[PDB]
Design a protein around this ligand. Structure first.
Ligand SMILES: NC(=O)C1=CN([C@@H]2O[C@H](COP(=O)(O)OP(=O)(O)OC[C@H]3O[C@@H](n4cnc5c(N)ncnc54)[C@H](OP(=O)(O)O)[C@@H]3O)[C@@H](O)[C@H]2O)C=CC1
Ligand SMILES: NC(=O)C1=CN([C@@H]2O[C@H](COP(=O)(O)OP(=O)(O)OC[C@H]3O[C@@H](n4cnc5c(N)ncnc54)[C@H](OP(=O)(O)O)[C@@H]3O)[C@@H](O)[C@H]2O)C=CC1
Lengths: 222, 223
């Protein structure tokens, strides 16, 4: 079973790859913007050569244009796709959010994942599990009130949520399992190791498409 | 008792019908925008007959046009009572795998960033007015909780993103007594733009509560 994970160099992404590298019969395509600086992940891949380290910047269309061939070097298929790489840089009031923050969150957090999926769709189509996870945020819900504003961050997660919902409908006949997942705050904060563990078991047990899920397996409103 | 309205995309469609409807009311000044005012025949004709209609250039896809809207509107008015972000595009429908990069980008810049930047530039003028009413012309296709059995692709995504930011804005400007709404103007099941405009103008007049997602008939939609 081939897993693909964007942003595997640090955070939850690293913790998810750490966990898969201990699981027998798991090939892992792990991405980093800058693999030669990805010390922890390059070490992970040397001690566990089933872990393949590939370049991806999801903000960079030229990098996304290369991801299908970069993945194609190591596998004929993807079972479980995880769009994890993302940014969270702008919060607070709309009047105080400049153009560049709106633009950056759209390109990195919405366009990136849509283009990434478009490029890797043929490889996912040939796999067995056809499981597709976009790492989202509960802040992206149009129906939760945290007593906070999330500015471009929140808008970006809501935009990708909208398209994830549509993708779930569109791919249901091809028996794809498409989910948006809040990995927790790494609300009580959790360790990347804890988010990873919960995410892993969610990834294995999820059998229906079109869900918006917290890491604990409970549903969120869109 | 004189009210100023700002309507973007006033050269045709709902915007034109809204400006046409406001032009008939006494004591209402209208700042009406067009991408290309020289070719805005019907709107220019309306402005010739009714001097309370001022026509100004605005391209909401264009940061350079948006950077000028505040100073240009200020030649015609010291305040805006009712702001209506109507100018937008609807060019991208159907499945995610068939929607190329440029359609996602165009709907982001035109339908999300444009309205947000336009509001930022015009806020001071709206702050200075009495009604403090802020309308974003959205779509029921932007809802995260409606199913129409249609794919809305970059159009729907853009309406959901603008919806997300509208709801936040309503929270931020509640202590300044702003009324902020996202409004579905109808499908122009279909109605005419003059029917939409009649319903929309009644809605803009009566709404006295912020943070609503409404249809033209004044019923609420789920976000
Ligand atoms: N943490 C939380 O509480 C919650 C967060 N989330 C999501 O969880 C995700 C997990 O991120 P996490 O690693 O834990 O935290 P960080 O944001 O600290 O790290 C983000 C990851 O994304 C990568 N990344 C950033 N920009 C790009 C880019 N342009 N191209 C490619 N990769 C990029 C980073 O690489 P690099 O090291 O080079 O910067 C890194 O792997 C978040 O990215 C977010 O969308 C959602 C809800 C809850
Ligand atoms: N009517 C419906 O059934 C539905 C429509 N809506 C909303 O309805 C509103 C009005 O629709 P309708 O009256 O039929 O519009 P039309 O389709 O007839 O025209 C759209 C308007 O937007 C203007 N516009 C487009 N791009 C720009 C730009 N870059 N800068 C400035 N103005 C621009 C147009 O100008 P130009 O002539 O130069 O193109 C025109 O005034 C829109 O906000 C739309 O999102 C929402 C969903 C459902």
């Amino acid at each position: 079973q081939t897993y693909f994970i964007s942003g595997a160099n640090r955070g939850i992404g690293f913790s998810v790859v750490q966990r898969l590298a201990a699981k027998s019969g798991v090939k892992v395509i792990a991405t980093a913007r800058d693999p030669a600086s990805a010390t922890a992940l390059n070490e992970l891949a040397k001690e566990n050569p089933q872990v393949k380290v590939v370049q991806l910047d999801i903000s960079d269309e030229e990098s996304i244009k290369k991801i299908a061939k970069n993945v194609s070097q190591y596998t004929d298929s993807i079972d479980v796709f995880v769009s994890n790489a993302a940014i969270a840089k702008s919060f607070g009031p709309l009047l105080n959010t400049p153009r560049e923050q709106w633009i950056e969150h759209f390109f990195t957090n919405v366009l990136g994942p849509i283009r990434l999926f478009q490029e890797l769709y043929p490889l996912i189509k040939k796999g067995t599990q056809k499981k597709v996870f976009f790492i989202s945020s509960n802040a992206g819900s149009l129906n939760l009130d945290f007593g906070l504003d999330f500015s471009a961050f929140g808008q970006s997660k809501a935009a990708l949520n909208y398209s994830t919902k549509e993708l779930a409908r569109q791919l249901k006949p091809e028996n794809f399992i498409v989910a948006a997942v809040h990995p927790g705050v790494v609300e009580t904060k959790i360790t990347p190791e804890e988010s990873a563990a919960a995410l892993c078991k969610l990834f294995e047990s999820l059998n229906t498409t079109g869900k918006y899920l917290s890491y604990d397996g409970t549903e969120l409103p869109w």
